[PDB]
Design an enzyme around this catalytic site. Structure first.
Site, PDB file in Angstrom:
ATOM      1  N   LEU A  17       1.286  -1.456  -0.186  1.00 14.93           N
ATOM      2  CA  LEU A  17      -0.367   0.181  -0.297  1.00 14.93           C
ATOM      3  C   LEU A  17       0.936   0.831   0.171  1.00 14.93           C
ATOM      4  O   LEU A  17       0.609   2.333  -0.720  1.00 14.93           O
ATOM      5  CB  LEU A  17      -0.975  -0.142   1.809  1.00 14.93           C
ATOM      6  N   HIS A 237     -18.237   6.150   2.540  1.00 14.96           N
ATOM      7  CA  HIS A 237     -18.140   6.888   1.828  1.00 14.96           C
ATOM      8  C   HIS A 237     -19.959   7.614   0.583  1.00 14.96           C
ATOM      9  O   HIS A 237     -19.922   8.171   0.841  1.00 14.96           O
ATOM     10  CB  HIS A 237     -17.132   6.009   0.167  1.00 14.96           C
ATOM     11  N   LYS A 377     -29.750  18.620 -15.406  1.00 10.86           N
ATOM     12  CA  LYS A 377     -30.642  18.610 -16.424  1.00 10.86           C
ATOM     13  C   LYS A 377     -31.676  19.014 -16.289  1.00 10.86           C
ATOM     14  O   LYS A 377     -32.844  18.677 -16.808  1.00 10.86           O
ATOM     15  CB  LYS A 377     -30.775  16.892 -16.323  1.00 10.86           C
ATOM     16  N   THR A 397     -20.537  23.524 -12.884  1.00  4.15           N
ATOM     17  CA  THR A 397     -18.890  23.717 -12.290  1.00  4.15           C
ATOM     18  C   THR A 397     -18.641  25.129 -13.005  1.00  4.15           C
ATOM     19  O   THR A 397     -18.136  26.129 -13.089  1.00  4.15           O
ATOM     20  CB  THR A 397     -18.606  22.617 -12.719  1.00  4.15           C
TER      21      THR A 397
END
Lengths: 469, 469
Positions: A17, A237, A377, A397
């Site tokens: 890792l 998450h 949208k 954005t």
């Protein structure tokens, strides 16, 4: 945090890792000087290595250039390595002495990084608290997921870590968290009366929280079986997304206030059985590739007959006045069709249709990755000699997410790190689910490698009320 | 409406209005064939002319090319001219005979255009109703502004026109109306829950209705004096903007329902006192180059000591449950800084400021002209390492407006034309103020040609609650 010295102690320097993600990340941060100037790195592992060996085995993943070989050799000018075992006070004292034998090591903010095997978290944290505490600056600890397996184990681990360190010192990190437009969603939500009051039960119909991956679990298949997608990404998450979407008005937007609102939302979540859970697992792609030709069960390191799921779809609700009766969606997985991480806020249709059923449910996507973008949208009239409207995607954005998160750890911002009590309540939510999992070993529904996931998840959103175009 | 024959009767073919704007407009629509295939134009005027004379006097403004000279001569191949007085049944019968002596003139939908001088509207409309009615197809007329001067005159004229034609056969046209961005406002208002539920008193702080024109009234200063800016643009175009913005629960987007909700809103506004009024008039520019060197009072055709205003700012507060207590602003004028026609829907600030007073009141601009565009100046976080938002202009978005309104008259769509009862109620709410104006001859505040208008208008916006940043 640009003056006082810092030490980024990477426990497990020989670890895969570390060598694959952590050392290249701090190299990215150091070539551009995003870490403080007087930053030291002190690895640590069982195997007896040297800085030259670290260079030899880590340069290819650093992928440096001859233009900045000088910056690279300055990057290893701050590096060091210490050899010792993970459960021995003698080597821990040797590590402490090596740390103190630097430019104000005792004064240095020892920012420990636990990249060492999960089976030792308790002992390593106990030894760290007993011996490796500097009494001058803050000593933050970074604990890598996961934080136990069920409610009882997680509670024991959390209580032990709380007795050792305070929550101002415990930093529960989540790699997948974007922190870029997970941060922009907050601004969009709070600084608008356009989206402000319609952030309630009557207007927002549902929230879709999605996190897909394009690659499977090649090689490291022996790490995922014991844990599962729920404990890997879905519980950390996706709950982070759900809490930051459902949170009430923080009223001071600080880390503590937002985490308290997260705790309030989670405490406003009732028990969840298997009735709001769907599981899935992937197999070999018939249209194979260099790595797609083999499925999850084709990995030799995966024990045979393992019912660990890599797809988890669950629906949560918040039992408070702002979010009363309104649903939320959790969806994730690995080896899906395409990388993505979006939060689609589908609003209610306007009561009373006048465009002859042409009104499409207004959306708001926050595509965390890849190609970060936020777009609404909404639907507007098409140019010409007409009157009917058209649904149009209206875009609304930079270090990478992981190095940004490490920078936030350095700064001290605990906005995006799960609290001890938040984790406790989050495990309390799914205690029936996890007990059923560990009791009966449920069989997830197979799905194709690189597909869109099991159809039962889309059926789950449809049962919720989510409308798919 | 592409098979049955139509006639566009331009009463006043020798008239300056016709030769300057109407004939070029129908030429623009005919070179692309937007009029029906079997369309005819039959002018009419006191002075005796011919088709060749019309060609000689109206060719230069068509700004055509020898490539489309063939199309232009085809366009004049369908033209016609009838000579006669405006108040004589003999010449009116001659006109009717000329109409019947065409390709199914009686069956043709005589779309009359009253471009003839305003002083004769009564007699001309009476004669048209008495003699120039075809009993086969629809016979609409286009009645040009202004529709009377005060409450009593407007009521008498409107009642006479109602007794002559039903409201299906009257078109109170307004050239300045865009018909496109107004058309998109309807969609943006209805097909969204992003703006829908917050289209009420608590959320939308105020509405600004603006209409400016960089050119004054050079030459034709003798027309604007007897009318005034209020009766020219404010009471028609700006009230049309207000009705489209404010109307409650429109129902089917049809003309009947939209105009009924306009009537309901206008019945839900009380009398306007002098306390909600600002007036302004422009003078020459010492630094100007072209017409700016001379002001409104410098026009030789303007009577001396005239108190007619060219700038009028009056706020309305619709009194019903959906809009109870809201500010609605009207701003207009001529010879202002630059052309514009916008509707700025400024929303409320979110209750509870957490970004340390960096929250700017969210807007929604609808620029009708020039360069039609909707942009929501909502506030989002700019990329970086700071948790701070930025006010960013987010864009949301083909004959011209007059062409499309003439096409609307041809089609039969009466959503953009003010109704008899709507006009009656607008004159009823302006009656006390207008009678005081005609009684005392108020003096408007002078302002500079090509400036932004009198400062008292901005004072009015600030008083009602509009925020300028």
């Amino acid at each position: 945090h640009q003056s006082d010295t810092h030490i980024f102690i990477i426990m497990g320097a020989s670890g895969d890792l570390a060598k694959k993600k952590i050392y290249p990340t701090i190299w990215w941060l150091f070539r551009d000087g995003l870490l403080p100037e007087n930053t030291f790195i002190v690895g640590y592992a069982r195997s007896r290595l040297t800085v030259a060996d670290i260079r030899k085995q880590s340069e290819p993943f650093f992928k440096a250039t001859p233009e900045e070989k000088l910056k690279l050799e300055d990057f290893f000018a701050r590096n060091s390595y210490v050899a010792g075992q993970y459960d021995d006070a003698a080597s821990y004292q040797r590590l402490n002495s090596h740390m103190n034998a630097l430019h104000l090591g005792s004064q240095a903010n020892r920012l420990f990084y636990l990249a060492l095997p999960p089976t030792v978290y308790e002992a390593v944290t106990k030894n760290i608290h007993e011996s490796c505490m500097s009494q001058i600056g803050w000593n933050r600890i970074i604990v890598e997921k996961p934080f136990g397996r069920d409610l009882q184990s997680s509670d024991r681990l959390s209580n032990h870590i709380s007795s050792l360190f305070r929550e101002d010192q415990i930093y529960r990190i989540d790699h997948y968290l974007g922190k870029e437009m997970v941060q922009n969603l907050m601004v969009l939500r709070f600084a608008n009366r356009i989206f402000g009051p319609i952030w309630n039960r009557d207007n927002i119909a549902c929230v879709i929280l999605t996190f897909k991956e394009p690659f499977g679990t090649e090689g490291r298949g022996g790490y995922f079986d014991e844990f599962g997608i729920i404990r890997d990404v879905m519980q950390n998450h996706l709950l982070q997304m759900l809490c930051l979407v459902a949170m009430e008005k923080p009223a001071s937007t600080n880390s503590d206030d937002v985490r308290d609102e997260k705790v309030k939302v989670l405490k406003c979540i009732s028990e969840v059985q298997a009735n709001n859970v769907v599981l899935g697992q992937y197999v070999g792609n018939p249209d194979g590739e260099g790595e797609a030709t083999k499925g999850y069960l084709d990995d030799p390191t995966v024990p045979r007959g393992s019912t660990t799921a890599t797809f988890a779809a669950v629906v949560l609700y918040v039992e408070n006045e702002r979010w009363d009766g309104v649903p939320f969606i959790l969806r994730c997985g690995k080896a899906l069709n395409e990388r993505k991480a979006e939060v689609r806020l589908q609003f209610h249709d306007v009561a009373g249709d006048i465009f002859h059923q042409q009104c499409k449910r207004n959306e708001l996507v926050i595509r965390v990755q890849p190609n970060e973008a936020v777009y609404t949208k909404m639907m507007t009239k098409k140019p010409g000699m007409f009157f009917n409207p058209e649904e149009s995607e209206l875009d609304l954005t930079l270090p990478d997410a992981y190095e940004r998160l490490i920078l936030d750890v350095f700064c001290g911002s605990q906005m995006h790190f799960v609290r001890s009590d938040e984790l406790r309540e989050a495990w309390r939510i799914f205690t029936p689910l996890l007990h059923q999992i560990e009791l009966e070993k449920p069989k997830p529904i197979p799905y194709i490698y690189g597909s869109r996931g099991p159809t039962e998840a889309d059926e789950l959103m449809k049962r919720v009320g989510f409308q798919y175009e």
